[PDB]
Structure formats: structure tokens, C-alpha cells
Amino acid sequence: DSSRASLTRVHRQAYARLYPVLLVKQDGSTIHIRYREPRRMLAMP
């Protein structure tokens, strides 16, 4: 039932493209983040 909060639309009118980038913390997991300059892998040291 997490897909309700994981599925939404941007209610505002002036914003850039949403890129589903994959953030990787050092814990060893990926997460879908909205970041410009769409690097597919986005690793933290």
C-alpha cells in the first residue's frame, strides 16, 4: 500500500523535468530520486 504515496503528480506549474535517478547510500541500496542532470547511478561515499 506504499504505491499510493509513491505514485503522485506535481501539482505546481513551473518546474523542470523529473529524472528517476538511482541514489546509492553506503548501506548498499538504491532509491528513486528526482534529480536534474540524469546520472542513472548516484553514489554517496
Contact residues toward another protein (CB under 8 A) are 1-11, 13-19, 23-24, 27-34, 36-45
Report yes or no: 23 and 40 within 8 Å, Cβ to Cβ: no
CB of 1 to another protein, least distance (A): 5
Task: Convert residues 3-22 into a mask of x (bound to RNA by CB under 7 A) and - (unbound).
Answer: ------x-x-----------
Tell me whether residue 13 or residue 29 sits nearer to RNA (CB atom): 13
Q: What is the spatial distance between Cα 20 and Cα 16, in angstroms, rounded to a whole number?
A: 13
Say how far apart CA 18 and CA 37 lie, in whole Å: 10
